[PDB]
Each structure stands twice: as C-alpha cells, then as structure tokens.
Design a protein around this ligand. Structure first.
Ligand SMILES: *C(=O)[C@@H](C(C)C)[C@@H](O)C(=O)N[C@H](C(=O)N[C@H](C(=O)O)[C@@H](C)CC)C(C)C
Ligand SMILES: *C(=O)[C@@H](C(C)C)[C@@H](O)C(=O)N[C@H](C(=O)N[C@H](C(=O)O)[C@@H](C)CC)C(C)C
Ligand SMILES: *C(=O)[C@@H](C(C)C)[C@@H](O)C(=O)N[C@H](C(=O)N[C@H](C(=O)O)[C@@H](C)CC)C(C)C
Ligand SMILES: *C(=O)[C@@H](C(C)C)[C@@H](O)C(=O)N[C@H](C(=O)N[C@H](C(=O)O)[C@@H](C)CC)C(C)C
Ligand SMILES: *C(=O)[C@@H](C(C)C)[C@@H](O)C(=O)N[C@H](C(=O)N[C@H](C(=O)O)[C@@H](C)CC)C(C)C
Ligand SMILES: *C(=O)[C@@H](C(C)C)[C@@H](O)C(=O)N[C@H](C(=O)N[C@H](C(=O)O)[C@@H](C)CC)C(C)C
Ligand SMILES: *C(=O)[C@@H](C(C)C)[C@@H](O)C(=O)N[C@H](C(=O)N[C@H](C(=O)O)[C@@H](C)CC)C(C)C
Ligand SMILES: *C(=O)[C@@H](C(C)C)[C@@H](O)C(=O)N[C@H](C(=O)N[C@H](C(=O)O)[C@@H](C)CC)C(C)C
Ligand SMILES: *C(=O)[C@@H](C(C)C)[C@@H](O)C(=O)N[C@H](C(=O)N[C@H](C(=O)O)[C@@H](C)CC)C(C)C
Lengths: 191, 186, 184, 182, 181, 183, 191, 183, 184
C-alpha cells in the first residue's frame, strides 16, 4: 500500500502519493539498507529541492542500519555540494553508514528523537583471488578506513585517533550519548 | 494491487479513511511499513495539527527500532494519537497501543494483548558478543521504563511480568493500565 | 485483472456503493483489515443503512477474524451475512455473528464448525502458558457461538470437538443462519 | 498486457453484459464472476447476461458460489462454451437458463465425479468421507435437474471421465443448441 | 574410519568395561549404549562399568532407555564427564552410582527444563501439555534424588540454562569428585 | 517508489535541468535508457551542456560503448560528475566526458583495470574469442590514452591489475579535470 | 581410499589399514575440524595406548584449523589424565583449538615441523532468543574465554594478560615464532 | 571397494613396492594419507627410496606442506614422478623431491603460480590476513628458489601469473632433474 | 555388486592375472591412475609378456589420459589396445597409442576423433596465457596422432577441426588401429 491524497482542481481532480506530498514540505526519507539505487533517489530528491529553492532547509529523516559505503558517499558529497542546509533527523536507528550521514548534516541541525539508537564501527570488506590482488584491495580498504575516520573526526570535533579506537568494534550510543559524542547537536521530544 | 480502488478523474479504501484521520498498523512491524505509518502521521499533522489521529493496531510485533520510529513520531507530532486494538496487539504492537494519548487508548472487546521481553541474536568473537549482550540489556531496561511510564505500574512489576509471554484480555489490559477503556457499541 | 466501470470504478468499489463487502479465501490480517476498513467507511457514509457481507471462506487466523467480528458489533449499521459456496471455521463464526434475522445461506452453500487449532515450540514453562491461552480462546469462541446460535455452550463444545458439516437447511435448524435465499 | 479502446477490453464487453470464466475455478476468480453478475443485475435486472466458459474445472465450493449467484439474480444467465467446459466448468455450463445454454461447434465438454483428499485420525477420515459422498449426491441431483436425465444415469456416467462433443452435449441435455455462424 | 587391533578400538576398550556416550542422544546411539551395558553385565555382573559422557543432550525417552538400563543391571555404572554433559547428558552423568560420578577438570555441565512442541486441535494440545508437565515433574524428582537437593530448588535452577564448572558440579551434587592425573 | 511533482516523476523533472543518472551495473537496458535521454536532450536543445552523474562499478563493455559513442555523436558537450564511485567501465565513461567538464566530488572513488572475458568450446573457437578480447583490450587502452593524455604503454602497465585513485589522484592522472566541493 | 598392509601368520594372512598399523608405533592422527565424534576417536586411541603400555610416549600428529571447544577439551583432559607423555607434532597447520592441543603436550616434547603454521584467537559463539537467555550464554562464553586464556598462560609460561591481548584478533606464528612464544619447545627438520 | 583380493587393492599391492600415489585435489584427509604411507615405509625400511607419483592440479597449501615437511623429515629419499600434470601445489611437491630423483614423463604438464586466498570481515582482520598471505607467498617463493636453484626474484616474477612448462622446460627451469621415456 | 571367484578375487583382479586391464567410461584422474597402477603392477610381475587394454570410453580429461599414454610408452611390455563399444576423443588417442600391429577394433565398435575442448574466465592477460596453452596442447596431440597413424600432421589437423566418426574398417584405413577381431 502507498496511500494517495486527492487535490480538487478546476478540471476535476489530481493525485499525490504521501511521499510526493511530504517532498513539497522539503522532507526526504532514507529508509533501510544503503545501496546505489535508493541512494541515487535520495541524491536526486536533494538536487530537485535545490532547483526548487536553493535557500530553504532540507529535512533528511534517517532510519537505516547502513549498507554500501560508496552509495552512502554519493549522498554525503551531494549534501555538502548543494547550497541548502540538510538537517538530519534520526528515526528508530542510524548505524554504520546511517550514523555517518546523520553526523554529516549542517552544524546545529543534526537531530536524534529520544529513543532513536546510533551505532558506529570501522568498514567491512572481502576479496578473493591472487595474493597480489588481495594486497591491492587490502591497501584500498585501509585508505577508505582512514578517510572515513578523518570525516567522522571533522563532523564530531573529536580527534581522529579517538574515532579510530572507538570504531575498532561496534559502539552503540543512546540519543543523549550521540549529543555528548558530537554525532548530533540536539534531541527533539515535542514540537 | 491497491484494494477496492476508484481512479481519480489509484485511490483506495485506506487513502479514503486517511482523510478521516485514520492510519492502520497491520502485521509484522519492520522499517518500510513503519516509515509509511510515520509518513501518514507527519502528513496528518501538516493538514491539521489540532485534530486527533486514530491508529488502528492489529500486529504481532516485529523489529523494535522500527516500532520506536513510530513511537517517537507519535510523541513528537502535536496531534493526540488515539490507539484502538483490533484482533491482537502483541510484543511491539502492545507497546505502541499503550503509547497512545492518555484517555484515548482503546481495546475492542475480543482483542488480545500480549507483552514479553526483547529477543536478539549475535554470532562472532566473545568480545563482540559481550558488546551486543550489553546493548540488549540497555534496550530491555529502556522498554521496561517506557512501559512503566505509560501503564503507571512500577518497573520492577513490568520486568517480572514480561520475563515470559503474558496474555491479557480487553478487561485485563484496562486493569493493567495498557489501555484506558473498551469500545463495544457506538 | 479486475474489470472497471465508468459512471471510473473497479467492480468492488462499484458494489461497495450498494453497501456490499466480500470476505473471500483464507482469513488473515491484511484481507480482514480491508473488510473492517470497508465497514468503517460504509458507517461514515450512512450509519442507518444495512451492510451486506458475502462470505466464501474456509477460515484462517482467529485474531484477524475477531478484528472483523468486533468491527461488525461496534458499527451502528446492522451487518447482514450471506454464505456463498462455503463458510467453515472462522468463516462460519463470522456468518453466525451477523444481525439476527439477516443471516442468510444460499441453497447449495456449505457450513462447517470445529474447535481452534494451534502449535508452540520451546521450554515446558512457555508451552504451559500457550496451552492455557489456547483453552481461554476456545472457551470464549464457544461462549460467542452459544450466544449467536441460542444453543447451550455444552452442546457447542461437544459438536465442535471434531469437524461438523451442515447443509443450508441444517444451518437454519442449528441457528447458525436464520433463512435461505433462492430467488429474489 | 490487456488492450484499451477509456475502457480495458473486458470492461468494454462488461457493458455488453459479457462475463468471462477462464482457467481453473478457485475462490478469488469465482468471486469476481459472481460480483460482475450482481453488478449487471443492479444495472438492469431484466436484460440477459452472457457467461463465456473456457475452464477445466477446479474447487467445487468456489463453483457453487457462482451457481447460487446465477440462480438468485433475476436476469437469465446464458452460458456459452468456448474451447472446453470440464468438471465444474461443465456443471456451470448446464446451470444456464434453459433455451440459452450454447456450445460452439469444436468446444469439448467432460463430466466426472468429485475428487477429494484428507489425512489424519480414522474418526476424522470417516467424517470427511461422509461429507464427500453428500456433496457427490447433491452434485448428481443438480446435474439430473438441469440435464433432465435421472440421477441413476448421471451417477453411472460420471464414475469415470466422460468426454462429449458439442452434438453429444446437446443429446445429453448439458446444452440446448450449437452456434456456428451469426 | 575406526582403527582395529589383533577388534575395533571401541570393542577393545569394551574389554576394559568402557562405554562411550558421544554426541546427540537419540534412539539408535542410546540403544547401542544400553546393549553394551547388558553385554558387560552378562560378561561379569559384579565388576564396575565406566561410561564416558560427551553429549549436549537430545531425546528424553532415548536417554531414559540408558537411565533405566543403568539402574536395572547389577554392576555399578561409573560416569566420567569429558568435554561436556548438558541437558540429558547431565541427567545421565548424575544418574551414575553414588561415589563414582566424575568430572574431568575442564569438563562443563549444564542443566535446564525439557523442550517440547505439538500442533493440532486444542483438545490434543491440552493432552500433550499435561504430558510435558508430568515428564518435567518426574525429571526434577529424579534430579532431586541423585543430587540430594530439594525438588523446589532443582525446579528454580532449571527454569533457564544453568552452566556449572567441574568444581560447581561437585558443590551442586551432580558429580562426587574430579579426576586430574 | 519514485515520487511525482506538478505531472512528472523526479528523474523526468531533473531531465528538464538536463541531468542524466548512470547508476549501478552497466548492462544493455539501463545503458539504452541513458543513450535515449542523451538523444532526447539533444533534440530539445543541441547547444546546451548535458550533465551525466556516474555512480557505477562497471559492467558490460559493449553496453557502455553504446553510451560512449552516443556521448561523442550528439552535438551537446556531456559533463561527467562522479558520485560515490566510477570503476571499470564507469571510470571509462567518466574520462570520456567533454574536456574541462569531467568532475569528481571530493570523496568519490575511481578505479581502472583491463577487460574480463570467458569462452568455452573447441580450441579453434577459443583462439577466435581470445584474439577478439586482445583487440578490444588494445582499443579500450587507446581510448583511455586519448582521453587522459597519458601514453598507451603507461595505461596498459597501470590497468594490468586493479588501480584505485582518489579524487585528487584522478585529477593528476587526467581521468577528470577538477573537483567540486560546494556550489 | 585407505591402503591395507598384509601380515603373514601360521594360518595364512591378516590385514591392517595404514592408521591401525601406525597405532602399533603409538602414533595418533588429529586431522581436520575438531568435533565430538573424531575427538572421541582420538581419546579412545589414547585410553587404548595407555592400557597397552602406560610408560611409553604417545605421538599425536596435529593438522587442524580447530573446531568445537568442548570436543577439544575432551582430548585435553584425556591427555593430562593418562600416565603416558603425549608428544604433540604440528603437520601443515595447528589453528585455534589445533594450537591449544599442540601447546597442551608434555613439556619438552611439543614439536613444529619447519613450514607448519600456528594461529591463536579468542573463542567464537552465537545464541538467539530471549534477552535473559542471551545474558546467561554471554556470561558462559566469557567464563570459557577466561579459562582458555588461563590454560594457554600455564602451558606457554606467558602471563594471562599478554595471552588475552594477543588473542583478541587472529595471531599467525611461524615455527620459529611458536618456539619464541612458548607454544612448542623445538623444531624437527631431519631425523 | 577398489580392485582387490580378500586375503587389499592395487594401491596396497604397490605400497609393498614402496610406491605412493598423490592424485587429484590436495586437501587435509588425502594429504594425511600420503604422509601416513611415508611414515609407514620409513618404519619398514628407512634406507630404500620412496617413489611418489604426482597427478594433481593442486589445492590447500597447508595440506601440501604437511607432505613437504614429512618428505624432508623421513630418512628415505623421496623420488617424485610427474604423471599427466603437476600444477600449483602439485608442482611444488614435484620439485621438493630428492635432488637427482625428480622425474617428468615426456607428455606431463607442469604449471606454477602465486597463492590464492580470500577473507571477509572488519578492515583490521583483513589487514592481518592480507599480511599472512604475503608471508606465505614469500616462504613458498623461498622454498621454490632453494629446490630449483633459481633466484627468488625470478620465481616471484614468473609466478605472478600462470606459467605452463613442458617436460623439457621443467628440466631447463630446474623443477625436475631428468625425463623418463622408456625403461 | 562385482562378483568374486575362489582359487578369493573380484572378476577384474582375476582377469588382471590374464594381463587384461579395462578403461571404461569418462577419462578422469582417479580412474586413469588405476589403469596406470595396473600397468606398473603387470610390468613388475613380468616385463616381457603383452598387456591387453580393453577401451570403452567417450574420452574426458587430456592430462589424465596422458598419464596412461606416458605409462604405456614407458613400461617394457607391449600394450595391445582392443576397442569395445566406442573409443572417442581421448579414448581414440589411447587406442591408436597401442603397440604397432596390436591395435584392434571389434567389428561393431565406433571410433571418433576431434580437437581439444577448453574454458577459462578472468582477466584478458590470463585468457591470453590459457589460449596459448590450449594451442600448444592441440599441436602436441596432433603431432602424436600423426606419429601413431602415419598420416601427416596437416591432415590430422584438418580432419579433427570437427567431429569425424569412423567405422572399424574406416579406423583400419585411417591407421588408428591395425586389424579387426570378429571370432577367436
Ligand atoms: C555500515 O554500514 C558498514 C557495514 C554495512 C556494516 C558499512 O560501512 C560497510 O562497511 N560496508 C561495506 C562496504 O561498503 N565495503 C566496501 C567494499 O568492500 O567495497 C569498501 C569500500 C569498504 C572499505 C560492506 C561491503 C557493505
Ligand atoms: C515483539 O515484537 C518482539 C519480537 C517480535 C518477539 C520484539 O520486541 C523484538 O524483540 N524484536 C527483536 C528485536 O528487534 N531485537 C533487536 C535486535 O536484535 O536488533 C534488539 C534491539 C533487541 C535486543 C527481533 C527483531 C525480533
Ligand atoms: C478455522 O478457521 C480454524 C482453522 C483455520 C482450521 C481457525 O479457527 C483456527 O483455529 N485458526 C488457528 C489460529 O488462529 N490459532 C490461534 C493461534 O495459534 O494464533 C490460536 C490462538 C487459537 C486459540 C490456526 C493458527 C490458523
Ligand atoms: C472438476 O472440476 C473436479 C476436479 C477439478 C477434477 C472438481 O469437481 C473437484 O472434484 N474438485 C475437488 C474438490 O473441490 N473437492 C472438495 C474438497 O476436497 O473439499 C470436496 C467438497 C468435493 C469432493 C478438488 C479437490 C478441487
Ligand atoms: C536436553 O538434552 C533437552 C534438550 C535437548 C535441550 C532434552 O532433555 C529435551 O528437552 N528434549 C526434548 C524432548 O525429548 N522432549 C520430549 C518430547 O517432547 O517428545 C518430551 C517427552 C519432553 C517434554 C526435545 C524434543 C529433544
Ligand atoms: C568493468 O566494468 C569490467 C568488468 C565489470 C570487470 C568491464 O570492463 C569488463 O571487462 N566487462 C566484461 C565484458 O564485457 N567482456 C566482454 C565479453 O566477454 O563479452 C568482452 C568484449 C571483453 C573482451 C565482463 C564480461 C562484463
Ligand atoms: C578455534 O578452534 C575456534 C573456532 C573454531 C575458530 C574455536 O575455539 C571456537 O571458538 N569454537 C566455537 C565454540 O566452540 N564455541 C562454543 C559454543 O559457543 O558453543 C563455546 C563453548 C566457546 C565459547 C565454535 C566454532 C562455535
Ligand atoms: C595451487 O594449488 C594453488 C591454488 C589451488 C590454485 C594453491 O597454492 C593455493 O593458493 N591454495 C589456496 C590456499 O591454500 N590459500 C591459503 C588460505 O587462504 O587459507 C593461504 C595460506 C594462501 C596464502 C586456496 C585456498 C586453494
Ligand atoms: C575428448 O575426450 C576431449 C573432450 C572430452 C571432448 C578431450 O580430449 C578434451 O578436450 N578434454 C578437455 C580438456 O582436457 N581440456 C584441457 C583443459 O581445458 O584443461 C586443456 C588441456 C585442453 C587443451 C575437456 C576440458 C574435458
């Protein structure tokens, strides 16, 4: 089910799906596993909303356990490139790449809901083939890990060495702990 | 696909009842169906932030974080979310039922309510097992605190009662403080 | 595909304007939710005109069916139940739950009643909790069957221990339905 | 991919009071037919309905939902056999309004006794066996009523698969006439 | 493959009056243990039998075939826990002759209530639920007898998984002593 | 679900801003869709630039060459912007963009390596397919050399195995021209 | 296949499989994944070789990536219990529980072949179910991890704290590194 | 069963003649059986030669090294004869034979290449496993250099990709000592 | 099962004492190794008595077949080859590899020759290496066929580009076998 809303016009009626209707309020949803196709859709929505009005805020609701890093960095670089401030709101959970995109929001507009969960940890990977090729892919994953820690350090305001220590294994944070760590700025309870 | 629809001049029975400020939470709670409920709520607030929203719940439960995305949306939006239990509200469904606005949490007479502690499952190195084991305790504690707050029963009693599956009738759900009243006839 | 009519409506939306709802196939949450939704819609449309629920169901999930039953009782409109093809298990329960004097079998429709089914796996403590719950549900279903049929709970219990098949005539004599429709 | 004309092809023919019963008979497709019949009755309860049947049969109760709908509604339901009408499809063909049951020249009709299948306790098997016999007796009675042949002859003939040509279906009394050209 | 001597290694150690209970307890492997116990009794009904247990548990009725065979035969059955004895394996460990129930130093013992599962008509579910409660009560009674702990305490402690070290198994009364060298 | 605007879907609405998306594995059908959009935008205005956002790990070479040959053929300059990553054929279509209009975003990844193949059958057929794979490998290395301005011998050495480049390394190598951070 | 050897007797001939023949030389093989059944067979061979002669050495050839811990601890407790010294020789590799049973040999008789590989790391596990049950199984894995570190410390002569640090992640050792770490005593190249 | 007498197959009969067969994929259980046969033949007679017939495409390195170390440890010289093919680990065990007693048959095929592997998990774990495969790769190149008498740099270069050798080429390279055509 | 005979031997072990070896079905490492093992055994038993290799094979793995071929050429005894049923691909190669004057077809036996099959997937550099190797093996196989048949390599190459089916008589005329055996 995708719920529709009917707007009456001079020439009868037209129809909007609920998500298209909330897109007019400049609200984008990032829901479930981060992969190329759904991530492109999020990026497209950001580019559209920029063209519509490049000075109004964009609200990105995140409920994700993470997924593909490159797919996520397509969203990240879009958020930084576009003029509008992208306010990030955590719903349910933002883990792995979802936490990274949550902390990547415009400073002062990164929000957790009270019972939302945040989790951070180092990249995952896996190659198979000749020893020479394993060394090349092993070198690449280390470069990506260094870069992801560098960006986390920038957005949190914590030193890179501390980000590295804390993401060696799964680190779960409550909403309060995400504010204290510097992943988000404030907690929204009631409007 | 979309059931009992008419073309606009597809508009279905759920789209029609959404105008009456009615949202349906049906079946297993997971990210996508939960995102749809939250979206409907955000929409109904923008339409009118002062009229009540009616959330019909028939769910055995599911993913806690997905359910919490609805719970936090219910508390955040200005409108009171009235919860009505149809058929059953169990696990996460029972949680969202009791999370309705005080005075407007309703069971139908032959609706079934069931509460129990969280489920989980990790595999890997003992160090990681300890981290996830700790995280599951944190979530279990939080869920008991919120269940205590909404029911008005002490956390020690919620914890005791939810160690194993606890089935309640509509009458028992009112007594326990999960719901406020029973609706039989209009 | 489902045919459309221009006046543009699918055939079910068009029959819904005549206050007709269809309960077809296995009773589960999603199809049962739809039935309940249609009942709420028709009440809001007109709370004093009868609703016609056509039933062709072998049964299914009890809680899903109790979502329909509780909706039927709650809404102001009388819900007339008509049995097409068959009403077995939960379908039979929803057929007999209709407004008194407006529960109808068609001549060659079949009705079947029997006790609930269930199944759990795990610790003996949990098995005992689930066994108790299934007994409470069985007692409650037998009580409501007794209420709607007018037969005593003891007889309903005896008759539903094993599968009991009724013709249209036998369903009238048992009190599951009131009358049989052949022609207008 | 169903073609358009404003209307889909089946919806356009539904304005001409034409319903199609195609493929295996089961609860959902059978309900759709019964719904189209109730709709056409509300539209005009005196004009004929045309039910084109191309079916190998299927679920009896699903078929009986159509049969009872056909008998209840005021309009005469003319049945036309396209390709084949076997088992339950043959039963619904013979259930049409007398004078208006039609086979096309190369259509195939076939009749045989019900199939079933239960497993479990001997007590439950006895209950389910008794139910299958009652259904078989009832199905034979209704076939006897619509064909005009006695129940004893319907019973003997449906013990095993009995195939009929269009000519043989008219002789047996399953249909009234054959349409070759308009 | 199982190596041989001039007899396979298991037949050769059966001369030393040693029986192995290894892996999941089911009808066929349990029948083999009970068969070996009847054989060793017929060979010499006075000399002790050594049962080496390395089992996570399994089918209760299959395990009760070994238990009843242990009690029935004239010879004392000395139980030695190697690797682990959990669930039904723990039950057979504690069912050994008093003073001859042994844990090796790094062997693990675990006890918990029975598992079950039926599906069908509510009447049948009630019959199978009652049966599972009767078995649970019986298993607790026999655990109480062999440990010396009261039935009420055994019931509480087996509501959920309870892991014991070799030392804890001695303190609980599941085994009598620990063999090291 | 792709949302609608007033009525267009979001991708049709961004196509009016002359923006095309190349997303996921390169195969015949998605590649055809890119080339169709390129022919459409040319007809609409054959002088205004086209913007191709690339986020691809690569895929089928022939499918990718359908996009490459469409890019060169149409009058409008095709500006290529690397989102997330551009590897294999994705990198090839990135470097194929109009010179001075090939862009990486800061944390976008670029990777290049030689073609993959595979035939089974008679030794005669294996020889024919092996030759064909060498000719394609040569042709791809020539086109990479032409677009980067690096000699073919260097492109061959550097693509014998997987070669991963950052945004900065992609500019130095000559795969892209510039990096875009903020508008 | 398994190759047979024929011994001639007064009454014609008898036949041994190669493994049964080498068992008369007091040689046991621990090969592949450690699980209850193959481990029970190793223990049975040890109890047999004790009964035959409780003063002569037993040679346990190890080529294993590891497996079930309780299965391996059934072999460990048998080794310590029986009178005979169990000399452990590493063939190909001894990882995980493989490395644990290699180091559990009689002191001075733990051997690596030159190109054999040794690897050590902390226990693996995995439960699913009620939070209460997860807690119990999580407490059990920790208790087992402590016990395994204690025994590794005792057999290697390194302190428990160093064993714990070094086994948090996979630690690979060459034959030389295994002697230096104290997992084995000596390296056999030629007889 | 096999091709036997009841008193015992053709392999058991040829084991009496001090002949062992290494056939098919190298893995723990078949490699354990080879090493066992080698220990048995030493105990029977530690001075007579052992003949190891090798027809293998290779397999698990650690399994193959259990044989290698057994070959070097036991007192008897192990003569290696290549039947059909010796590739990867099979070629390694062929070249590991006693100097002067490593034999190719005329139409036997030899192929050498670097190790294969694969891990998936946390970047930290990947770094550890990536290091281990480099150590193993070095060690295998060192042992090949020793047995062939070629420098490790040439072994490394040649095994970066698959290198196929004829019987003649295997003698020239030093993988084997001589070719046996007729007795 | 395989029948036994008492003197206790299986039927194949008994015929092995008559110096008969069977090559039956798809040629692969394990079954080819068994044939080679038998050839070494019979040489050790008596290096001056002929060995009789019965061939019924569609072919299979070339290297596995070359393990038999090199064993045949190496051992002192003449290896007589008799074709039962069929000798195709590698089986035809091993048939023609028998001692000159002792390569035999049975009257209704079928022979078939064709060029090698192969298959690699991976990087274009690896595909070039494997392609070159396939061509070297193809050249070597054609050379050895040319030697044993006494036909020039150009003709063997032409005739094996596609599947070439020969009767017993056609096999003798081509030089793949020397004579046909009908009766003893
Ligand atoms: C959190 O989202 C992480 C996991 C999904 C839990 C995510 O950040 C992650 O590690 N993703 C991994 C990934 O994208 N890895 C790529 C790759 O191997 O190609 C590398 C660029 C990482 C160095 C997995 C593969 C999804
Ligand atoms: C009721 O709905 C419970 C289950 C469906 C029976 C639900 O509350 C629940 O426990 N869900 C469980 C869950 O969400 N667990 C998560 C997780 O493991 O990620 C933790 C937050 C709880 C420790 C699973 C999804 C059923
Ligand atoms: C008739 O509809 C019955 C079956 C379909 C034959 C139906 O009444 C029924 O018993 N359904 C069962 C069911 O809903 N059981 C629930 C349950 O276990 O959830 C028990 C609570 C009933 C006490 C089965 C599960 C379909
Ligand atoms: C012709 O259509 C027959 C079969 C498709 C061949 C049909 O008449 C039939 O026998 N249907 C069967 C059926 O519906 N049986 C039900 C049942 O199993 O409950 C009994 C009521 C009739 C004996 C098959 C099983 C669909
Ligand atoms: C320990 O070994 C227990 C499980 C393996 C964890 C074992 O004692 C157990 O509970 N076994 C169970 C069983 O045998 N149950 C039978 C049954 O349901 O048939 C009942 C007689 C006990 C209530 C499971 C089924 C193996
Ligand atoms: C990058 O995109 C490469 C692969 C995804 C790794 C791509 O360049 C590539 O090699 N594609 C391959 C391909 O298209 N090969 C064709 C073919 O064999 O059909 C040949 C033309 C290459 C010589 C694979 C097969 C997709
Ligand atoms: C090396 O052998 C380790 C793994 C096989 C890589 C081994 O020591 C190991 O961790 N085994 C795990 C194990 O035995 N776990 C049991 C269990 O949870 O059941 C615990 C007793 C260990 C804490 C197996 C692989 C699960
Ligand atoms: C030749 O036999 C090679 C392959 C079979 C083609 C063989 O040498 C090889 O590389 N084997 C590989 C292997 O054993 N890898 C192990 C491993 O990943 O565990 C590493 C020690 C290699 C550095 C694979 C597993 C067959
Ligand atoms: C006849 O027996 C041939 C095929 C079965 C038709 C046989 O001669 C053959 O070609 N076998 C092939 C083979 O051995 N190919 C290897 C290989 O690809 O590894 C190459 C050496 C071919 C040059 C196939 C694979 C069975």
């Amino acid at each position: 089910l995708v719920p529709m809303v009917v707007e009456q016009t001079t020439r009868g009626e037209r129809s909007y799906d609920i998500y298209s209707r909330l897109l007019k309020e400049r609200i984008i949803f990032l829901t479930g596993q981060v992969e190329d196709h759904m991530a492109n859709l999020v990026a497209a929505q950001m580019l559209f909303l920029e063209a519509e009005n490049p000075e109004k805020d964009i609200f990105l609701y995140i409920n994700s356990p993470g997924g593909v890093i490159t797919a996520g960095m397509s969203i990240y670089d879009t958020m930084q490139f576009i003029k509008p401030d992208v306010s990030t709101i955590c719903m349910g959970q933002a883990c792995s790449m979802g936490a990274f995109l949550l902390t990547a929001g415009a400073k002062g507009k990164r929000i957790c809901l009270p019972n939302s969960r945040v989790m951070i940890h180092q990249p995952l990977g896996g190659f198979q083939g000749q020893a020479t090729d394993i060394e090349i892919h092993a070198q690449e994953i280390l470069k990506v890990k260094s870069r992801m820690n560098e960006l986390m350090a920038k957005h949190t305001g914590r030193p890179i060495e501390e980000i590295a220590k804390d993401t060696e294994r799964d680190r779960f944070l409550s909403a309060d702990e995400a504010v204290e760590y510097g992943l988000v700025d404030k907690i929204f309870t009631h409007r």
